[PDB]
């Protein structure tokens, strides 16, 4: 879980997005593999957004 290199025309579009409305762009990666979904857990019947 350590920093590595990231680039892409998409992420670039993020960069330009900040280039309009300025906010320092912090690059983090994903933890899990999926994008995300409200999903059913294994117990307790509570909404899990993945």
């Amino acid at each position: 879980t350590v920093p590595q290199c990231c680039y892409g025309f998409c992420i670039d579009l993020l960069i330009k997005l900040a280039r309009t409305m300025q906010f320092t762009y912090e690059v983090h990666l994903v933890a899990d593999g999926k994008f995300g979904t409200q999903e059913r857990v294994q117990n307790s019947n509570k909404k899990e957004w993945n």
């Binding site: 993020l14 900040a18 906010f23 320092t24 762009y25 983090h28």
Partner: peptide, 8 residues
């Protein structure tokens, strides 16, 4: 108040 640091 917003933060300049913007994470993704």
């Amino acid at each position: 108040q917003m933060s300049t640091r913007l994470k993704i």
